[PDB]
Each structure stands twice: as C-alpha cells, then as structure tokens.
C-alpha cells in the first residue's frame, strides 16, 4: 500500500477511456514488448528528439494491455507510474528519503512479477540525494522493470556522464514520422477535437494542415507541429460562433476610439476619417444582415490563415484587396522612383510570382543583383519596395559589405565556434532572420568584400539555409536578397558584363536570377524628379506651414544647370539646398518670415530671390 | 626508362626493408617549376609572407622523420634554378629552411626519375 | 556586506526581500543610494539568473528611488550586456570642468586642509 500514496495508476485510467487512439508505430510497441519480457537486463528506455511522441507509445501499450492483444507473459501487469517529486517533500531529516524509497522498493519486491514502473524523465533519478544510488542492486538482478523515456541531449548530459548506470538499460530509438503517416494519424484524433469544440472538420483541412506546415513552421518535429494548427483554427471558429464575428468588432472599437479622441479634442481631419469609417462599418453591417437573411466548419483556407497570423508570412490564398495592390504595384512603385521601367518590371515579377504560388518551394522568393552607374536609384528602389510591403523603412535588414574587407570578418555574422569569448551574443545577421522570417535583406557595395564572403552567399542561394555557431539551420526560404554594385560605368553592356565575370566566379553568377543593368537619366525625365524634392521640402517645414508657391520658370531653371551626365541626380539635391535653403535659413532666424505665412520665389537673372 | 615497370615499386621496396617503415617515402613532383616564383615553394617563405605556416614543400617533411627515402618525379621540365638548390643537397649534408633552422641530409636516399629514353637501347 | 554568510540555498534571497519590504513598508520616505551599481547584476550566483532581477519588477512602478554612480566604461560591460535593466534608469552625464571653475573649487577647500595640517 506504499505505492498508493506516492504513485499513480495508468491502468485504472486506461479502463475508463481517458486516452486517445495511438494508431501508428507498431514496430516500436513490438520492440518494447520484445525487450520487456527478457530474463535479465530488461528495462527499456525510449530515446527520441523532443516532439516525436514517446509518452504516447506507453499510453498505446497501456491501451493494448487493457484491450488484450498482448502476448502470453503480459497477463494483467498493471503499469504503475511513479513520482520522484513526491518522494522529496518534507523529508528534511537524516534518513527519511532513503526509508521512503526502501518502502517503495519493498512494495515492489514483495509482488511476484506484476508491477511495471513507468518513470518519465529519468534524468531526475541521477541526483535527488543532497543518496539516490540504491537502485543498482535492484536493477542488476532483473527484478525491477522500469519503462522510462527521456529526450536526446538530456540523456548524454546526465546518463552518459554516469557510465556505470548506463549498462543496465537498453535504447529504443524513436524517430520522427513522415508526412503521409502524419496524415494517417490526423484522421484518428479528429473525434476528440470535434467533441471538445463543437465544430466540423473536412478531410481537405487535415491534408492541407499537414502539407502546409511542412514549408512554413520549421522548428518542431511533426507528429504535433501540425496538431496546433487544427487546435487553434477550432478555437478561432469557436470565437466567431459566439456573439459577433471579427471585423465589425474591429471597426466598432476603432470608431469608438476615434470618437473618444475627437470629442476630447473638442482636429477636423479625423472627423473625415470618422465619417468614412462610419460609411464602411455601415456597409458591412448591412452586408452582415443580408447574409443572415440568406461559415460553420473549418476549411483549407483557415489553416493558412492561422499560419499567416503566426510567424508573419502572408500565405493565404489570393487575398481580396491585394489584387488592387499587386496589379497596381508596377505603377504605385513608380511614384517614388522615376524611370527604370525594366527593373521595376523585373522586381514585380518576383512578388506576383510567389504571391500566387507558382515559384519553387526550396529557393528564396527573389535574390538578384542590380548595378550600373551612380545616382540612378539602386538604393532608392530597395528602400522603395519595402515601404508598402511593411509600412516602415526599418523592416529592411541592411548590412553593409564595405566593412568586410579582410578574411576573418565573416565570423561576425555566423557567431563563434563553441568555446570562445562571444558565444552569448550569437550571430548578428542570423539571429535577426530567425525572428519573423519575411524581411528584405540588402548587401551594399559587393565590390568591396574580400572574396571569401562569397562562400557564405553560395549556400544561401539554391538551398536557403545556413548553420551558425549555435547549431540551428535558419531558413532564408522566403526572404528577398538584393545585391548592389558599381562596376565599370564605361560601356553599354559589354564592358560591365566583362568586368563582372572578371571579378566574380562562374559558380556564383550561375546561382543568380536576372542581373539588371541600369541606364542612367535623361533631361526630359529629370524635371519630373524635381517637384518631389520640392514636395519633400514642402513636408519638411510642415510643422510651421511655410508652404512654397514655386513659379514654373524656377522649376524650368533648376533643370538646365544641375544636369550632369556622369554624377546622376545627386548634384540637384545639393543645388536645392544652395538655392533655397541658404537664403531661407538666413531670413528665418532674423524675423520677418514668421510661421503660418507663405513665400513665393521669382527667377533672378542669375540667382532666385525670395 | 619507361613508366609502369617497378621504377617506384623498387622505391617502396627499399623503404620498408632498410628503414623498416612502410610510409617513409616522399614523392614530390617538379612538374610545376618553370618560373622564378615557383622554386621558393620547396624551401619556404620568409617570416611574414604567404606560405609560412605550411613551411617548405620539401624540408618540413624531413625535419621530422629524417629516415626517409626521397623521390623526385619528372626532373626534365624543371627550370634551371632548382639544380643549385638540389646541388648542395648532393654536395653537402646541410640546407636552410624558411625559418632559419638546419636540416641534415646525411642519412637519406635521393632518386631522380624521368621517362625520356625507352626506345633507344 | 549583505552576502556575508549565505552559503545556504535561501538566505540571501529572503535577506534582500526583507530589506525591500522594510523600504516598501515606509510610506514614501527613504531615498536609497547604491554606489557602484554595476556589481548589482550578478550579485547572487545560484549556480540560472535569480538574483539582481528581484528589484526588476519593483523599479518599473518606481517605489524605491535608487541614486547610483557608475563609471562610463564600466557601464557598457555589465549593464548594456544585460539590457533588460537599462531602461529602468535615467542617465545623467557628468563632464569635467575647465581651469577657471577649478580655481573656484580650490578656494573653497582651503578650509579643511588648514585644520588637518596647521599651516
């Protein structure tokens, strides 16, 4: 009766139907039964990487024992699970723990051959004394039976350190299942999730949840890396079955917020955005009613909705409103970069490719180098495409490869080999892509790097992964890699495509997509630039409202002088701060150009006065 | 003489007998030595230059285990700036390395092979 | 002087908790002053960080006032290493004076060196 206070009982909990079907893994159940009935040295250990299902093997063994498909020498063994945490509780005297353990071993020994102890996480059995060593004569007589499961590394951290204990055990290596066997499992666990949450589940949902968790979520092994998607889609549908959906709630809370703010200010402005939002919320509401007048189960879109809401990556199915964006993207990106039609037509062809799901799975969604002369826009394009995807300029990861001039700088983006000074810090590129893997990665001035960094950007391409000084293959599988350059500027296409093959190797140019050589500028397509600068200046002094009434001959005059065929559009942005900014900054801190007032500009025969 | 005869099978046959070691031969090939910047690979670089940790191509395999037979494959294409290095090998029992230490050749065997001939008697 | 004899597995922890409850149990009076606070991070090494982050939930509401003074190059070695705490503190930079203010400082300390040395 000593086991009644300290242990538990799986078998009484197995007869009452508290467990899930464990259909799968017949080989390992047969292996455990093959070991457990041996004469001596008959105590197996289930060893596997964490996630693969090791307690469920023992639950399936218990269900098979209660069912009665076991061999002859397993007639009602009544598996009893122990607790090593309950043993050390109040045992604060000189001998209380060892006499408790001796009472437990006596109540195991006086039985004939029945009780099969199940000790989960038996790295705890190593210490627990300050003792804990009076198990070796009980183990090395074939008297204790002791099924117990650990993980992989916790085995070698404790038990391989203890090479005398290690002999009196077996090892049953449990490995990960496949994707098809995951699908075969997920048709069995469906009834419990339909009982606990009152929903319905299509088989298409269970095959899409097993296909779609292979690509995106890559940290956990897959009997249970795909259970959570179903288990959270059911909860989201249970949210939407109760009182109200989601959007209408979103909009109601938002308009209540803007209402609050506005009435507190009593800004206009918001007054408009209120009204607009009230129009929308009205429309939707009516639509809601209409629908009612006219979802109730999970589908293969809801799983992708969960894997899009988690881990950042938008991976739904041809979403609404974005077709008004991606088919407008080739023209919306032109409002910030003027000219270069071929480069934008090639960049859009990598976002509209992978949004529709045509691109290759184990490959980055775009990784391509573009170059030319200076002042053209090759940095402005990368900062201009990542503005509408991300709503901020700082979601870019912009590392500069001008500083990596020598050999050993490569270790700053991979970490340290384990055993050296900076190991707590880890990497400096890799530890920022493992968090939310959807960024845009830049590489500025790839001319300047030592030719050993190209041995790191070589398995990034065509595979997508890299290890580091921590032992974790991060995935670059759906980021966008942008390389810049400045080679040559001395021909149309022949000299720069000779210099690229002169500097780079053939095995690196092979791994790229379309290399995009730019063209420069033209004076007709320069004037269209200039107003942006003026409009940008019209934003910069917006906090004092000194908006500029610029005459059109001034915009004409800024285009004649300032055109250089070799320095791009960069002399113009210094010419503006020489013409306007000097005289305005002199007139602004002396009085007389007080805020809330407007100033025009007129073309003097050499300058332009205020 | 010819190739494929025993011309290096004789060489392995006297290392394992007279030096009692199976792997105590050094087969270097002078099939790259046509220039002035190629001879310095078989002696080393000064302390501060390109090939220094690897040492000499010849001497750092003779400093340890100085009980070796040494071959020299295909001498006939070598530039005439090896034979002054190779001459004092067979004229004195000393040579200087890239570091500045001393190697002693007084208990080795040199074998200079080629393949021209074999049609003339 | 608070880690004097604490070789048992729970003495320093309850000692610091008793000090914090003695400060909290006085209704907003005591200004604490911990000099050279760059050695407060790894105060109690429990083999597992469980000391030096006991005041970490208490500073966020601001119940103890905690004047400190650390060196500039001792600050990016211990606190910036362990940057969860670095937001809890405002920084007050102190630069050295010039010659003309040192002339004014030295004329006020010519009252304590005439007493210790009767000159």
């Amino acid at each position: 009766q000593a086991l009644q206070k300290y242990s538990t009982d799986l078998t009484a909990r197995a007869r009452e139907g508290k467990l899930d079907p464990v259909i799968g893994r017949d080989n390992e159940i047969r292996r455990v039964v093959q070991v457990l009935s041996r004469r001596t040295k008959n105590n197996p250990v289930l060893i596997g990487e964490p996630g693969v299902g090791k307690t469920a093997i023992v639950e399936g063994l218990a269900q098979r024992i209660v069912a009665g498909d076991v061999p002859e020498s397993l007639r009602d063994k009544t598996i009893v699970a122990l607790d090593l945490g309950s043993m050390v509780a109040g045992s604060k005297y000189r001998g209380e723990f060892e006499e408790r353990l001796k009472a437990v071993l006596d109540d195991i020994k006086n039985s004939a051959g029945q009780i099969i102890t199940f000790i989960d996480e038996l790295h705890t059995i190593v210490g627990a004394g300050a003792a804990g060593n009076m198990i070796k004569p009980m183990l090395a007589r074939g008297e204790l039976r002791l099924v117990g499961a650990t993980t992989l590394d916790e085995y070698r951290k404790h038990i391989e350190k203890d090479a005398a204990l290690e002999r009196r055990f077996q090892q049953v290596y449990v490995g990960e299942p496949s994707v098809e066997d995951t699908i075969g499992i997920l048709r069995g666990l469906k009834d419990r999730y339909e009982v606990h949450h009152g929903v319905r589940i299509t088989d298409s949902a269970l095959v899409a949840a097993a296909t779609l968790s292979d690509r995106y979520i890559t940290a956990r092994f897959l009997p249970d890396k795909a259970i959570d998607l179903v288990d959270e889609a059911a909860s989201r549908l249970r949210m939407e079955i109760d009182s109200r959906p989601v959007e209408i709630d979103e909009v109601e809370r938002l308009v209540r917020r803007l209402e609050i703010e506005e009435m507190a200010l009593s800004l206009a402005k918001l007054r408009s955005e209120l009204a607009d939002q009230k129009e929308k919320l009205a429309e939707l509401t009516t639509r809601w009613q209409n629908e009612k007048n006219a979802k109730e189960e999970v589908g293969p879109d809801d799983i992708a909705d969960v894997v899009s809401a988690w881990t950042g990556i938008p991976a739904g199915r041809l979403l609404e409103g974005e077709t008004a964006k991606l088919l407008r993207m080739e023209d919306e990106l032109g409002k910030r970069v003027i000219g270069q039609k071929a480069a934008v037509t090639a960049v859009s062809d990598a976002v509209r490719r992978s949004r529709a799901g045509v691109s290759d799975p184990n490959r980055p969604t775009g990784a391509f180098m573009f170059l030319g002369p200076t002042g053209v826009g090759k940095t402005e394009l990368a900062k201009a495409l990542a503005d509408f995807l991300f709503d901020d300029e700082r979601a870019m990861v912009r590392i500069d490869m001008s500083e990596y001039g020598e050999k050993h700088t490569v270790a700053r983006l991979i970490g340290a080999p384990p055993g050296y000074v900076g190991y707590e810090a880890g990497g400096q590129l890799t530890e920022a892509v493992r968090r939310r893997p959807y960024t845009v990665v830049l590489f500025d001035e790839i001319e300047k790097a030592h030719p050993d960094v190209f041995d790191v950007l070589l398995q990034v391409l065509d595979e997508g992964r890299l290890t580091d000084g921590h032992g974790r293959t991060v995935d670059f599988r759906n980021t966008i890699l942008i390389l810049t350059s400045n080679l040559g500027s001395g021909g149309s296409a022949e000299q720069v495509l000779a210099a690229v093959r002169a500097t780079f190797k053939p095995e690196f140019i092979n791994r790229l997509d379309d290399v995009l050589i730019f063209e420069g500028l033209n004076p007709e397509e320069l004037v269209r630039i200039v107003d942006i600068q003026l409009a940008q200046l019209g934003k910069r002094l917006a906090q004092r409202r000194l908006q500029l009434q610029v005459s059109l001959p001034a915009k004409r005059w800024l285009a004649q002088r300032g055109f250089d065929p070799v320095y791009g559009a960069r002399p113009l942005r210094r010419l503006v701060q020489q013409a306007i900014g000097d005289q305005l900054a002199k007139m602004l801190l002396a009085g007389q150009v007080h805020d809330g007032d407007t100033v025009p500009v007129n073309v003097s025969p050499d300058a332009d006065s205020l | 003489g010819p190739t494929g005869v025993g011309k290096t099978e004789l060489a392995k046959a006297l290392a394992d007998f007279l030096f009692d070691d199976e792997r105590a031969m050094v087969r270097i090939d002078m099939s790259e030595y046509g220039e002035k910047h190629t001879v310095a690979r078989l002696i080393g670089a000064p302390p501060g230059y390109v090939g220094y940790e690897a040492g000499g191509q010849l001497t750092e395999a003779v400093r340890r285990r100085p009980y070796t037979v040494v071959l020299f494959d295909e001498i006939e294409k070598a530039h005439p700036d090896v034979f002054d290095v190779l001459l004092q090998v067979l004229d004195e029992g000393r040579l200087t390395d890239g570091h500045g230490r001393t190697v002693d050749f007084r208990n080795t065997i040199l074998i200079l092979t080629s393949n021209l001939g074999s049609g003339g008697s | 002087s608070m880690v004097a004899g604490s070789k048992y597995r729970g003495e320093f922890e309850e000692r610091l908790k008793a000090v914090l409850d003695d400060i909290k149990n006085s209704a907003g009076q005591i200004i604490t002053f911990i000099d050279e606070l760059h050695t407060i991070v790894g105060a109690g090494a429990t083999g597992a960080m469980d000391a030096g982050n006991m005041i970490k939930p208490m500073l966020a509401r601001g119940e103890l006032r905690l004047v400190g003074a650390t060196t500039l190059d001792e600050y990016r070695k211990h606190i910036e290493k362990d940057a969860a705490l670095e937001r809890r503190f405002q920084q007050v930079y102190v630069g050295e004076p010039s010659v003309e203010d040192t002339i004014g400082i030295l004329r006020g300390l010519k009252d304590r060196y005439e007493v210790h040395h009767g000159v």
Partner: peptide
C-alpha cells in the same frame, strides 16, 4: 533530531580567444 541544510555552489568556466596573424602577401 538533526536536519541536513543543503547548500549552494558557484561554478566557473572561462573562454579562450584567438589571434588572426595577417600575412603581407608577397
């Protein structure tokens, strides 16, 4: 009558560092 009163400990493990030894390339 006698209690045990388990105690704590402190473990140290330092870290090596390497020098890079540039080569004058001639």
């Amino acid at each position: 009558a006698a209690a045990a009163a388990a105690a704590a400990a402190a473990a140290a493990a330092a870290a090596a560092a390497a020098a890079a030894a540039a080569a004058a390339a001639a």
